[PDB]
Amino acid sequence: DDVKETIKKSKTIDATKYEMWTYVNLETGQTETHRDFSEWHVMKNGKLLETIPAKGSEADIKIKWHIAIHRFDIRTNEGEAIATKETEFSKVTGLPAGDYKKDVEIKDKMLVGFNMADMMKSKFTVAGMAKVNPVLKTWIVENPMGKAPVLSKSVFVVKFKDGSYAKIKFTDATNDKQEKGHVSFNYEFQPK
Secondary structure (H helix, E strand, O other): OOOOOEEEEEEEEOOOOEEEEEEEEEOOOOOOEEEOOEEEEEEEEEEEEEEEEOOHHHHHHHOOOOOOEEEOOOEEOOOOOEOOOOOOOHHHHOOOOOEEEEEEEOOOOOOOEEEHHHHHHHHEEEEEEEEEOOHHHHHHHEEOOOOHHHHHHHHOEEEEOOOOOOEEEEEEEOOOOOOEHHHHHHHHEEEO
């Protein structure tokens, strides 16, 4: 009558587009996809050349949400994370103590527009500002160009702004045709 039931589910997110974030509610399973909200910056010959106006805002997101995914970049909604040494959820007892890390801001670094014709002209587009979690980024050990990504086997724990938390184990970074950016994970979420 006073501890809410744990929500144990799997999800598959299409994060293939450089332009987009997918916002994920782990309590309800709802998702929403929106174009990145920053001012975009075209880099040409190693310097900031052109701007593309900022469009929309996070107020356009209707659902509550916990994590968001852009390609293999993972952020939280003002949350914090650790990578445990465990490989199985049953070995992570409760909310572990540890050195939890909040999301960081990265300037003119996250790709929002990328193709080979422009790359050969030394041109590509980045988010003016973006938020990414430096612990969750480690879910990928290696991502060699043209080749299979290598995933961490660690269980992550993420603490959310309402006091909830989840154990998360990532299982796939490609679909069954080996297309990169289809991100799958299992999780166990404790509601408050």
